[PDB]
């Protein structure tokens, strides 16, 4: 591979694969899948019931001790029966490593709050609740953190429109800021950019 191509690292790949197998062996009750990406990133797909145990293990085990929670977020995939996927990114300073833990939920199934494992989760789950409508059970105080007071809906959902449903202005008759249905002087221009002639043969799906 020539200078324009990102170099590979087989040593880290082997180490991450071995540790993924190790984690899957220790907790077979919850670990559904283990993957390592070609750029050496380890993800562990677990059942929703194992959020508190697995995280606790990854925080407290002598061989793991992932003591830092870098980020916690959600991804909305409407085609799946379980709509939302919950992603935890953890960092271990002792072993200079990163791990990703993935689980899933739908609109109505609550997910156990992990504030007892990581304090940093407190706001993150709140943001998820604000943006995706995922409820976290036993959260110390769950409420909106980013949207306006009284905002209806969850904007980061795929079916939520980009400009929303209401807009704000100042009305002199009532002498205050009011909210009315959105009306754009220029509509957002939707661009169809995806080309035919697929780009990456290595990701081709079976034709079923």
């Amino acid at each position: 591979t020539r200078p324009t191509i990102r170099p590979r690292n087989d040593v880290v790949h082997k180490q991450l694969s071995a540790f993924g197998q190790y984690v899957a062996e220790i907790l077979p009750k919850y670990v559904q899948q283990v993957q390592v990406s070609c750029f050496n990133e380890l993800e562990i797909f677990i059942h929703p019931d194992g959020v508190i145990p697995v995280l606790t293990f990854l925080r407290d085990h002598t061989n793991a001790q992932f003591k830092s929670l870098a980020d916690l977020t959600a991804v909305d995939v409407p085609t799946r029966q379980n709509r939302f996927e919950i992603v935890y990114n953890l960092l271990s300073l002792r072993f200079n490593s990163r791990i990703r833990v993935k689980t899933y939920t739908d609109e109505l199934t609550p997910i156990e709050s992990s504030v007892t494992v990581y304090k940093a989760a407190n706001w993150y789950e709140r943001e998820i609740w604000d943006m995706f409508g995922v409820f976290f059970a036993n959260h110390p105080d769950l409420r909106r953190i980013l949207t306006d007071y009284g905002f209806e809906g969850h904007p980061f959902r795929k079916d939520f429109p980009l400009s929303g449903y209401v807009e704000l202005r100042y009305d002199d008759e009532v002498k205050r800021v009011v909210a009315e249905p959105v009306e754009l002087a220029q509509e957002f221009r939707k661009f169809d950019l995806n080309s035919p002639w697929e780009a990456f043969p290595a990701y081709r799906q079976p034709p079923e």
């Binding site: 109505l108 199934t109 609550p110 409820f135 059970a137 769950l142 409420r143 909106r144 306006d148 007071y149 009284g150 009305d171 008759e173 009532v174 205050r176 800021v177 009011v178 909210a179 009315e180 249905p181």
Partner: protein, 115 residues
């Protein structure tokens, strides 16, 4: 089958109990909200608005949806009591600046193409 994990309530009866508790809290809070925000509405029409908002969701027959709505209503009450909302947020429930939309067929036919 069709077995699902609960949120707060196992059947509809517990859900209605939670709904009644939230309704009591809102009904109690309405006069204090009217006085604190210096609203020009009356307590009667504020309680009518609370009743209308509750009745908007009267067709729900799923306890999980019911107690999720109860959670959202409790969040709204928390925002109102702690005066995190302003007067504009409270008055947004009334839509005082919106011209009324007629419902009959002829008026909709006259104004435009929108059903």
């Amino acid at each position: 089958g069709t077995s699902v994990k609960p949120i707060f309530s196992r059947d509809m009866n517990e859900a209605k109990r939670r709904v009644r508790e939230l309704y009591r809290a809102w009904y109690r809070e309405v006069p204090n909200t009217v006085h604190l925000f210096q609203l020009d509405i009356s307590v009667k029409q504020g309680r009518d608005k609370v009743r209308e908002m509750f009745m908007k969701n009267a067709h729900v027959t799923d306890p999980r949806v019911v107690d999720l709505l109860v959670i959202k209503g409790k969040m709204e009450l928390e925002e109102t009591i702690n005066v995190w909302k302003q007067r504009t947020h409270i008055m947004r429930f009334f839509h005082e600046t919106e011209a009324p939309r007629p419902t009959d067929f002829l008026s909709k036919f006259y104004v435009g193409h929108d059903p």
